[PDB]
């Protein structure tokens, strides 16, 4: 029941050890003893709580220690325990799988043709946002794409849901990494716990980055708000955003059109 | 895959023949079959490989015992242990003996004699030579072993100066200057070898591999390249590779290309790196293809056949890859149908029409599922790689023979096939064709269809919409644009590419039960949320006072706690 008695008017040279000694091993074996000391001064405030397991043990302690001389005083052992309209809410926690993790930014692309490569799968999912990795298993007919942003991954699940990649309607949803999948597979063949770990945060406030933004390749930028200052490099490292993003982008897409028409990239 | 279980099975099957004490022709052939299945699966390191050669030699199968030795030489370059055994055997042989015994000896001498631990190999050949009475032949091996930086070089020098009582110093000056120059190099090489001899220790670590010192040893034998180098860096690569690492192969090939030996040596090294290296590396392989294209200009006929067998072997293992098919087809158009400008034009045009004829009969043959293995292109077509053959046929029919009617007939036929309706170079060639003719009707009908019924990768759809907007703005006037606007699709070629860019599934033109409502704040997690049926929050309070407000009707009050998830991940991939 964790029955608590509130001893008070204690002497200054009486310890929590002595308060345990006068509470535990007489009439009970009390679960805890805690004198309130001063939070910066250390000198005991003269009152402290003790926590007995059983309520009969505490009341037996209460009737017998009332007035009992402890290190020079009578230690006043009254029981500690046993209408606003508005209170703040309180809620449970959804136990952190891959769906209920608010930082999970890796899409599970399922139902692939198995005739689709990794570069051809990078070509679909790239303009939604910058992309850390696109590895796919050998013949499980399903892939894995991971973005830097949660916003870009949500845009990819919205925009590319049910789109056919090489004539098979694709199945997009959430799903963990390769390390976490190996961990869950071995701890599911041992079926012990299969608990997951939260994906790492960006340690915000972060000021340079405007999420869901791509730049493909000397900088004196005026660092003003409307522009973009920092960015993630495409695979990986962080680049200061140059002035000439559109020239490099448009020039690379004219390159991509003229080389893809003749056959040097199927992506 | 289980090389340990493949090691364990041969260790178990051999222990079944050995402990049942019989010849055991089942288990003898099973241990041989387990040896063949392993050696095809694994490179078979020489220490493990020797037991297989020892058991077959114990089973007295002389012709087969020679053949497994050749495989061992390919598997391990530093296999002096297999080299000496193959030299120790085949001396107990038939009439071809005297020629074969030196042939294996000299082949090892071009394989292993530049190693620091090669002192046993020359001595064994010397032992073979001293058993003969060709003291001239013994003398020739003595001078060659003197000139190479070997372990017991001083031990070899003094020994050869006492056994050769008849002809010791016929040329004193020549022998000792070659010996001391060998000692200058071996003193130099002693720095790297002792730095290697003090790191190699099997503790399952980087020191057992000695990769830092092996990269140190290979580097310092690269720069001071006194022409033993190409044999030495081969010997340096051989001890360093044996300790799969493709970057070491690339550095050895880069050095040997810079050293400019004849190219067939490089082709041998390239074939070996093709053979023993694991699949999916995909970087030395395309290097080999572009080396075969570059060196094609020097010698014509054999490089076409090396190229052809290479591209066939690489569509064995990467069938989903498409750059090989167009690369094969570029080489076929260059080599088999070649015709310069200086030739009379009817010859030129007939070679173009022959190429169109073979290419069209190839794709028409493969669609109707009849194959013709005499023509190599028929074998090479894969359904991932069919589209690039159709593209080559289109681009050759339209740009070379120059008839637009036949070209439009091929487009209108092949865009209905299953294999190539979703292919990128077919449709992007179609875009360049209907851009060449400047008509906009087919282009507007194409990009109006680009998300719904012609499925392309989003990077290609973005490129097509951007370039078509840039093209339309500069090649079309308002009188064409305002007559191009039709209202049932709300299509307008100025603004519709600007809206259709990142979302492919874009339709241009009971809400509470759609799958955009139900998972509104949180994607993927679907919850039917409670709501009031007749809410008044759109109604102003200036109009609520006119008549009294009804009670609220509710919907979905049972489901404030129910939240449900379609977990594709666990079902289709964790639990298969």
Coordinates of N, CA, C and O in Angstrom, one line a residue, chain B residues 62-139:
Chain B
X62 N 46.5 -40.0 -62.3 CA 47.6 -39.2 -62.9 C 47.1 -38.1 -63.9 O 47.6 -36.9 -63.8
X63 N 46.2 -38.4 -64.8 CA 45.7 -37.5 -65.8 C 44.8 -36.4 -65.1 O 44.9 -35.2 -65.4
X64 N 44.0 -36.9 -64.1 CA 43.2 -35.9 -63.4 C 44.0 -35.1 -62.3 O 43.6 -34.0 -62.0
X65 N 45.1 -35.7 -61.9 CA 45.9 -35.0 -60.9 C 46.7 -33.8 -61.5 O 46.9 -32.8 -60.8
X66 N 47.0 -33.9 -62.8 CA 47.6 -32.8 -63.5 C 46.6 -31.6 -63.7 O 46.9 -30.5 -63.5
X67 N 45.4 -32.0 -64.1 CA 44.3 -31.0 -64.4 C 43.9 -30.2 -63.2 O 43.7 -29.0 -63.3
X68 N 43.8 -30.8 -62.0 CA 43.5 -30.0 -60.8 C 44.6 -29.0 -60.4 O 44.3 -28.1 -59.7
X69 N 45.8 -29.3 -60.8 CA 46.9 -28.4 -60.5 C 46.8 -27.1 -61.3 O 47.2 -26.0 -60.8
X70 N 46.4 -27.2 -62.6 CA 46.2 -26.0 -63.4 C 45.1 -25.1 -62.8 O 45.3 -23.8 -62.8
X71 N 44.1 -25.7 -62.3 CA 43.0 -24.9 -61.6 C 43.5 -24.3 -60.3 O 43.1 -23.1 -60.1
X72 N 44.4 -25.0 -59.6 CA 45.0 -24.4 -58.4 C 45.8 -23.2 -58.7 O 45.8 -22.2 -57.9
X73 N 46.6 -23.2 -59.8 CA 47.4 -22.0 -60.2 C 46.5 -20.8 -60.4 O 46.9 -19.7 -60.1
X74 N 45.4 -21.0 -61.1 CA 44.4 -19.9 -61.3 C 43.8 -19.4 -60.0 O 43.7 -18.2 -59.8
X75 N 43.5 -20.4 -59.1 CA 42.9 -20.0 -57.8 C 43.9 -19.2 -56.9 O 43.4 -18.2 -56.3
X76 N 45.1 -19.6 -56.8 CA 46.1 -18.9 -56.0 C 47.4 -18.6 -56.8 O 48.0 -19.5 -57.3
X77 N 47.7 -17.3 -56.8 CA 48.9 -16.9 -57.6 C 50.2 -17.1 -56.8 O 51.2 -17.4 -57.4
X78 N 50.2 -17.0 -55.5 CA 51.3 -17.3 -54.6 C 51.4 -18.7 -54.2 O 52.0 -19.1 -53.2
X79 N 50.8 -19.6 -55.0 CA 50.7 -21.1 -54.6 C 52.0 -21.8 -55.0 O 52.0 -22.7 -55.7
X80 N 53.1 -21.3 -54.4 CA 54.4 -22.0 -54.5 C 54.3 -23.4 -53.9 O 55.0 -24.4 -54.3
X81 N 53.5 -23.6 -52.8 CA 53.2 -24.9 -52.2 C 52.5 -25.8 -53.2 O 52.8 -27.0 -53.2
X82 N 51.6 -25.3 -54.0 CA 51.0 -26.1 -55.1 C 51.9 -26.2 -56.3 O 51.9 -27.2 -57.0
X83 N 52.7 -25.2 -56.5 CA 53.7 -25.2 -57.6 C 54.8 -26.2 -57.4 O 55.1 -27.0 -58.4
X84 N 55.3 -26.3 -56.2 CA 56.4 -27.3 -55.9 C 55.9 -28.7 -56.0 O 56.6 -29.6 -56.5
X85 N 54.7 -28.9 -55.4 CA 54.1 -30.3 -55.5 C 53.8 -30.7 -56.9 O 54.1 -31.8 -57.3
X86 N 53.2 -29.8 -57.7 CA 53.1 -30.1 -59.2 C 54.4 -30.2 -59.9 O 54.5 -30.9 -61.0
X87 N 55.5 -29.6 -59.4 CA 56.8 -29.9 -59.8 C 57.4 -31.2 -59.2 O 58.2 -31.9 -59.8
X88 N 57.0 -31.5 -58.0 CA 57.5 -32.7 -57.3 C 56.9 -33.9 -58.0 O 57.5 -34.9 -58.3
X89 N 55.5 -33.9 -58.2 CA 54.9 -34.8 -59.1 C 55.2 -34.4 -60.6 O 55.9 -33.4 -60.8
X90 N 54.8 -35.3 -61.5 CA 55.0 -35.2 -63.0 C 56.5 -35.3 -63.3 O 56.9 -35.2 -64.5
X91 N 57.4 -35.5 -62.4 CA 58.7 -36.1 -62.6 C 58.6 -37.6 -62.6 O 59.4 -38.3 -63.3
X92 N 57.7 -38.2 -61.9 CA 57.4 -39.6 -62.0 C 56.4 -39.8 -63.1 O 55.2 -39.8 -62.9
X93 N 56.9 -39.7 -64.4 CA 56.0 -39.6 -65.6 C 56.6 -40.5 -66.7 O 57.6 -41.1 -66.6
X94 N 55.9 -40.4 -67.9 CA 56.1 -41.1 -69.1 C 57.1 -40.4 -70.0 O 57.9 -39.5 -69.5
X95 N 57.2 -40.7 -71.3 CA 58.2 -40.2 -72.3 C 58.1 -38.6 -72.4 O 59.2 -38.0 -72.4
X96 N 56.9 -38.0 -72.5 CA 57.0 -36.6 -72.6 C 57.6 -35.9 -71.4 O 57.7 -34.7 -71.3
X97 N 58.1 -36.7 -70.4 CA 58.6 -36.3 -69.1 C 59.6 -35.1 -69.1 O 59.3 -34.1 -68.4
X98 N 60.7 -35.2 -69.8 CA 61.8 -34.3 -69.7 C 61.4 -32.9 -70.2 O 61.9 -31.9 -69.7
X99 N 60.5 -32.9 -71.2 CA 60.0 -31.6 -71.7 C 58.9 -31.0 -70.8 O 58.8 -29.8 -70.6
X100 N 58.1 -31.9 -70.2 CA 57.0 -31.4 -69.3 C 57.5 -30.9 -68.0 O 56.9 -30.0 -67.4
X101 N 58.5 -31.6 -67.5 CA 59.1 -31.2 -66.1 C 59.7 -29.9 -66.2 O 59.5 -29.1 -65.2
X102 N 60.5 -29.5 -67.2 CA 60.9 -28.1 -67.3 C 59.8 -27.1 -67.7 O 59.9 -26.0 -67.3
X103 N 58.8 -27.6 -68.4 CA 57.7 -26.7 -68.8 C 56.9 -26.2 -67.6 O 56.6 -25.1 -67.5
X104 N 56.6 -27.1 -66.7 CA 56.0 -26.7 -65.4 C 56.9 -25.9 -64.6 O 56.5 -25.0 -63.8
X105 N 58.3 -26.2 -64.6 CA 59.2 -25.4 -63.9 C 59.4 -24.0 -64.4 O 59.4 -23.1 -63.6
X106 N 59.5 -23.8 -65.7 CA 59.6 -22.5 -66.3 C 58.3 -21.7 -66.2 O 58.4 -20.5 -66.1
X107 N 57.2 -22.4 -66.2 CA 55.9 -21.7 -66.0 C 55.7 -21.2 -64.6 O 55.2 -20.1 -64.4
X108 N 56.2 -21.9 -63.6 CA 56.2 -21.4 -62.2 C 57.3 -20.3 -62.1 O 57.1 -19.4 -61.3
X109 N 58.4 -20.4 -62.9 CA 59.4 -19.4 -62.8 C 58.9 -18.1 -63.3 O 59.4 -17.0 -62.9
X110 N 58.0 -18.1 -64.3 CA 57.3 -16.9 -64.7 C 56.1 -16.6 -63.8 O 55.5 -15.5 -63.9
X111 N 55.8 -17.5 -62.8 CA 54.7 -17.2 -61.9 C 55.1 -16.9 -60.5 O 54.5 -16.0 -59.9
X112 N 56.2 -17.5 -59.9 CA 56.5 -17.4 -58.5 C 58.0 -17.0 -58.2 O 58.3 -16.7 -57.1
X113 N 58.9 -17.0 -59.2 CA 60.3 -16.9 -58.9 C 60.7 -15.5 -58.5 O 61.8 -15.3 -58.0
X114 N 59.8 -14.5 -58.6 CA 60.2 -13.2 -58.1 C 59.7 -12.9 -56.7 O 59.7 -11.8 -56.2
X115 N 59.4 -14.0 -56.0 CA 59.0 -13.9 -54.6 C 60.2 -14.1 -53.7 O 61.1 -14.7 -54.0
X116 N 60.1 -13.5 -52.5 CA 61.2 -13.6 -51.5 C 61.2 -15.0 -50.9 O 62.3 -15.5 -50.5
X117 N 60.1 -15.7 -50.9 CA 60.1 -17.1 -50.4 C 60.2 -18.1 -51.5 O 59.8 -19.3 -51.4
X118 N 60.8 -17.8 -52.7 CA 60.8 -18.6 -53.8 C 62.1 -19.5 -53.9 O 62.4 -20.1 -54.9
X119 N 62.9 -19.5 -52.8 CA 64.1 -20.3 -52.8 C 63.9 -21.8 -52.9 O 64.8 -22.4 -53.5
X120 N 62.8 -22.3 -52.5 CA 62.6 -23.8 -52.6 C 62.3 -24.2 -54.1 O 62.7 -25.3 -54.5
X121 N 61.7 -23.3 -54.9 CA 61.3 -23.6 -56.2 C 62.5 -23.8 -57.2 O 62.5 -24.7 -58.0
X122 N 63.4 -22.8 -57.1 CA 64.6 -22.9 -58.0 C 65.5 -24.1 -57.6 O 66.2 -24.7 -58.4
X123 N 65.6 -24.4 -56.3 CA 66.4 -25.5 -55.8 C 65.8 -26.8 -56.2 O 66.6 -27.7 -56.5
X124 N 64.5 -27.0 -56.2 CA 63.9 -28.2 -56.7 C 64.1 -28.4 -58.2 O 64.4 -29.6 -58.6
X125 N 64.0 -27.4 -59.0 CA 64.4 -27.5 -60.4 C 65.9 -27.7 -60.5 O 66.3 -28.4 -61.4
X126 N 66.7 -27.2 -59.6 CA 68.1 -27.5 -59.6 C 68.3 -28.9 -59.2 O 69.2 -29.6 -59.7
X127 N 67.5 -29.4 -58.3 CA 67.5 -30.8 -57.9 C 67.1 -31.7 -59.1 O 67.6 -32.8 -59.3
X128 N 66.1 -31.3 -59.8 CA 65.7 -32.0 -61.1 C 66.9 -31.8 -62.1 O 67.2 -32.8 -62.8
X129 N 67.5 -30.7 -62.2 CA 68.6 -30.4 -63.1 C 69.8 -31.2 -62.7 O 70.5 -31.8 -63.6
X130 N 70.1 -31.3 -61.4 CA 71.3 -32.0 -61.0 C 71.1 -33.5 -61.2 O 72.1 -34.3 -61.3
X131 N 69.9 -34.0 -61.1 CA 69.6 -35.4 -61.4 C 69.9 -35.8 -62.9 O 70.2 -36.9 -63.2
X132 N 69.7 -34.8 -63.8 CA 70.1 -34.9 -65.2 C 71.6 -34.6 -65.2 O 72.2 -34.2 -64.3
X133 N 72.2 -34.9 -66.4 CA 73.7 -34.6 -66.5 C 73.9 -33.5 -67.4 O 75.0 -33.3 -68.0
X134 N 73.0 -32.5 -67.5 CA 73.0 -31.3 -68.2 C 73.6 -30.2 -67.4 O 72.8 -29.3 -67.0
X135 N 74.9 -30.3 -67.0 CA 75.5 -29.3 -66.1 C 75.5 -27.9 -66.8 O 75.6 -26.9 -66.1
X136 N 75.3 -27.8 -68.1 CA 75.0 -26.5 -68.7 C 73.7 -26.0 -68.3 O 73.5 -24.8 -68.1
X137 N 72.7 -26.8 -68.2 CA 71.3 -26.4 -67.8 C 71.3 -26.0 -66.3 O 70.6 -25.1 -65.9
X138 N 72.1 -26.8 -65.5 CA 72.2 -26.4 -64.1 C 72.9 -25.0 -63.9 O 72.5 -24.2 -63.0
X139 N 73.8 -24.7 -64.8 CA 74.5 -23.4 -64.7 C 73.6 -22.2 -65.1 O 73.8 -21.1 -64.6

